[PDB]
């Protein structure tokens, strides 16, 4: 099958600045790929087909270029109602249609040291029997921020699930939230919980920990 | 204009059969073919079907061949899209699209709104609201709306008199097939020891209006 | 000292523009609830200029 990586993953940038897409197939291609745009949420909406043909009715500011495998979306100059997920899907193959893995174009802005939190399990969650400790990295940027969890000073994968909220509208700031869940048979064999945050905006990882049954 | 509307989605345990419908308005529905495309929570998009014009061609993904069917009715203008057999691989929102025929290859000219299909093997179940209170420069509270299904969950806080400095993240489908919700609100630390602050989750599905009371931990 | 000359002093929030507020509801400066009465942390909005 054809598979379309399309780089890069997420990039930042301003209104005004000169956006530009790349999106290789595994295969070639002749002029048959194309570009969408998405909204969180909303429904994708066609930009660019044939890869050098601009949808009606789509302003003029996106230009589609290349062939073959290589193919690029260019934008000018970046408008704040163009900040979405833009795809690529090859058109070659009609009967194996596959789409790009997408590039987030996220508002470029300073770096956000993240605020940590961390809150041990409800004394109600223990009497079910689970129990959850909530690690929470608030108002940071870029989303780009490393989480990780320790028990006895000993590394936790797996365990937990994280959830990360969009690019904030007032101070396009990112918060995570990372669940570590397990058994309260697993929670007494342990003493120290702690989570560790690394970001871009943090000299050295910051620590916050906390012994069971301490307050 | 052209309106296409999407109905028929909803919650169906695996291996049940759905019946989706299409109704596209403002143009010629039967000289174009129509295009299945389903997308999942947080996923990318799929490409999925395609019936004709004429609704004598059937065409549909390897992952869904054998397994869906897709029929038009010119007459009524609508697109019928029967789902059989469903997997939890099916849970997705699913959207008609026009062709627009421009190009000898298939494009995509637009899109509807879609209609949401869940696949899952739990029955509708009440949300459990849990606190999650603050410690001793502002604070930081919140709920905890765990073992709940299917979505969604409505979060207020103060019966809505609250809205500035509330967080709800996007609900998680835990392992147990359930989902997993947490509320957030930050407050000065001066207000902390008199101010009530509750929670209100409603649930419709499984019909559960709960109000949570969040107080400061004691110790 | 003229004193028929008020205005607003506590709002639980900021008026939209071109907003008429004229509500006597006894603000709750303090997060104790005032139930219409005032004393502590329970002031009336309007001030009187001097």
């Known amino acids: 099958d054809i598979q379309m990586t399309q780089s890069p993953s997420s990039l930042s940038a301003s209104v005004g600045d000169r956006v530009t897409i790349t999106c290789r197939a595994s295969?070639?291609?002749?002029?048959?790929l194309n570009w969408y745009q998405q909204k969180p949420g909303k429904a994708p909406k066609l930009l660019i087909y044939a890869a050098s043909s601009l949808q009606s009715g789509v302003p003029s500011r996106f230009s589609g270029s290349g062939s073959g495998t290589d193919f690029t979306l260019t934008i000018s100059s970046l408008q704040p109602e163009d900040f979405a997920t833009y795809y690529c899907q090859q058109s070659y193959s009609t009967l194996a249609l596959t789409f790009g893995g997408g590039t987030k174009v996220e508002i470029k802005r300073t770096v956000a040291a993240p605020s940590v939190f961390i809150f041990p399990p409800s004394d109600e969650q223990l009497k079910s029997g689970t129990a959850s400790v909530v690690c929470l990295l608030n108002n940071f940027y870029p989303r780009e921020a490393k989480v990780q969890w320790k028990v006895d000073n000993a590394l936790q994968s797996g365990n937990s699930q994280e959830s990360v909220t969009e690019q904030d509208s007032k101070d396009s700031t990112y918060s995570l939230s990372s669940t570590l869940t397990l058994s309260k048979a697993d929670y007494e064999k342990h003493k120290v919980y702690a989570c560790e945050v690394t970001h871009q905006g943090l000299s050295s990882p910051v620590t916050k920990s906390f012994n069971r049954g301490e307050c | 204009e052209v309106q296409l509307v999407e109905s028929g989605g909803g919650v169906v345990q695996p291996g049940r059969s759905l019946r989706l419908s299409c109704a596209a308005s403002?143009?010629?529905?039967?000289?174009?073919?129509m295009h299945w495309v389903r997308q999942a929570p947080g996923k990318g998009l799929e490409w999925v079907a395609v019936i004709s014009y004429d609704g004598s061609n059937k065409y549909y993904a390897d992952s869904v061949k054998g397994r869906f069917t897709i029929s038009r009715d010119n007459s009524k203008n609508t697109l019928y899209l029967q789902m059989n057999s469903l997997r939890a691989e099916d849970t997705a929102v699913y959207y008609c699209?026009?062709?627009?025929?421009?190009?000898?290859?298939?494009?995509?000219?637009?899109w509807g709104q879609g209609t949401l299909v869940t696949v899952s093997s739990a029955s509708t179940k009440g949300p459990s609201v849990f606190p999650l209170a603050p410690s001793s420069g502002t604070a930081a509270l919140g709920c905890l709306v765990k073992d709940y299904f299917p979505e969604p969950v409505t979060v207020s806080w103060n019966s809505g008199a609250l809205t500035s400095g509330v967080h709800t993240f996007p609900a998680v489908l835990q392992s147990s097939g359930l989902y997993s919700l947490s509320s957030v609100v930050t407050v000065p630390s001066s207000s902390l020891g008199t101010q009530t602050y509750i929670c209100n989750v409603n649930h419709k599905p499984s019909n559960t209006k709960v109000d949570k009371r969040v107080e400061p931990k004691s110790c | 000292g003229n004193y028929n000359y008020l205005y607003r002093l506590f709002r639980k929030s900021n008026l939209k523009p071109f907003e008429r507020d004229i509500s006597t509801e006894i603000y709750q400066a303090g997060s104790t609830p005032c139930n219409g009465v005032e004393g502590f942390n329970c002031y009336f909005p309007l001030q009187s200029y001097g």
């Open positions: 403002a143009f010629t529905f039967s000289s174009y073919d």
């Open positions: 295969q070639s291609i002749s002029s048959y």
């Open positions: 699209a026009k062709d627009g025929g421009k190009l000898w290859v298939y494009y995509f000219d637009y």
